């Protein structure tokens, strides 16, 4: 599960809401640990 | 991170070259459909 907001709220260009800033836990080298990863995804790859 | 402004990806195609190329395609299609027909190009229908 990813928690996402728009990458640029200010932008009014045609590319509005296409890039989303998503946060997720993913995994680490060790089984017992987790991290927090922030990354950008395109709207076409992410479904609500 | 996206540095600078967020911009839309796009292609530039010269209008005159495309118009001449398409006209040539129309002439060759007329050879199979007739000299008194109308050839219309339109956008692709909805789908993936």
């Amino acid at each position: 599960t990813l928690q996402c907001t728009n990458y640029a709220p200010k932008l009014r260009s045609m590319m509005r809401g296409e890039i989303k800033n998503c946060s997720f836990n993913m995994t680490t080298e060790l089984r017992d640990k987790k991290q927090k990863v922030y990354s950008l995804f395109y709207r076409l790859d992410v479904v609500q | 991170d996206v540095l600078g402004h967020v911009r839309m990806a796009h292609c530039n195609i010269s209008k005159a070259t495309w118009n001449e190329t398409l006209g040539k395609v129309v002439k060759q299609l007329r050879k199979h459909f007739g000299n008194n027909t109308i050839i219309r190009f339109a956008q692709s229908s909805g789908g993936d």
Epitope: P9, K10, R12, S13, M14, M15 | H5, R7, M8, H10
Partner: antibody, heavy 128, light 106 residues
Framework: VTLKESGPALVKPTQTLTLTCTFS??????????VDWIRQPPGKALEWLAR???????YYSTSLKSRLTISKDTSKNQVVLTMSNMDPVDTATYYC???????????????????????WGQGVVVTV | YVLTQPPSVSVSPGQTARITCGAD??????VHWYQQKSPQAPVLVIS???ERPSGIPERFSGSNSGNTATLTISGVEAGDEADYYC???????????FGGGTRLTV
């Protein structure tokens, strides 16, 4: 970038007000700059009236949609604002100003930002 | 969507004044700031929250986040006090919305 307003000083009730703003240093439909109109009643904050963009787009304040009309003539380097049914409450200093847009990408994709009103005219005072 | 400004900010000479402009989700739109002294058209002091137009003293700065936009003017002198206004162009409704103005007092 100079803008100069002209119009009547005295307006009768119900009379239509006409304001003309002449541009110097820029022109519409050549560059990507727009022009709008703002009014300021005496002792009150500025009230936005309406805007015209370089691409013939026209926008109006929701309070004056039934009364305010604007037009552009690029051969004269002029913009005209008109308002029907002028009322005593409409006494104000009227200004025209240049809407400067910062363009970084493709205009077809609206790749620009509203930079604000950097250059204003001097305005006229209209009393109804 | 309404832009709410304080009616005034009163400061000592040289003290920093904070002129705010609140509205729901103001941090999602660019806020312009203007300075009006004499009954003449105002001069733009802040462009898109963080850009200082050329010719404006370094005393002028600002930011915009959440529900509050702020104009910070450090080093206030007798020559700076003015009625300051916030303006936002709302692309969603395609019109410019103006605040009520804030008067500075030295």
């Amino acid at each position: 970038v100079t803008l100069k307003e002209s119009g009547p000083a005295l307006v009768k009730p119900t009379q239509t007000l006409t304001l003309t703003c002449t541009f110097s240093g820029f022109s519409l439909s050549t560059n990507y700059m727009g022009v709008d109109w703002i009014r300021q009643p005496p002792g009150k904050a500025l009230e936005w009236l309406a805007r015209i963009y370089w691409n013939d787009d026209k926008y109006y304040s929701t309070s004056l949609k039934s009364r305010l009309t604007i037009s552009k003539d690029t051969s004269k380097n002029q913009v005209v604002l008109t308002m029907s049914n002028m009322d005593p409450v409409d006494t104000a200093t009227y200004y025209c100003a240049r809407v400067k847009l910062s363009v970084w990408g493709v205009l077809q994709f609206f790749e620009w930002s509203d930079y604000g009103l950097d250059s204003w005219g001097q305005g006229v005072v209209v009393t109804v | 969507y309404v832009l709410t400004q304080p009616p005034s900010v009163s400061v000592s000479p040289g003290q920093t004044a904070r002129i705010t402009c609140g509205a729901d989700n103001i941090g999602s739109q660019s806020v312009h700031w203007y300075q009006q002294k004499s009954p003449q058209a105002p001069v733009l002091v802040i462009s898109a929250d963080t850009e200082r137009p050329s010719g404006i003293p370094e005393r002028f700065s600002g930011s915009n986040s959440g529900n509050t936009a702020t104009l910070t003017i450090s080093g206030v002198e007798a020559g700076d006090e003015a009625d300051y206004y916030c303006q936002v162009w709302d692309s969603d409704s395609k019109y410019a919305l103006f605040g009520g103005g804030t008067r500075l007092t030295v």
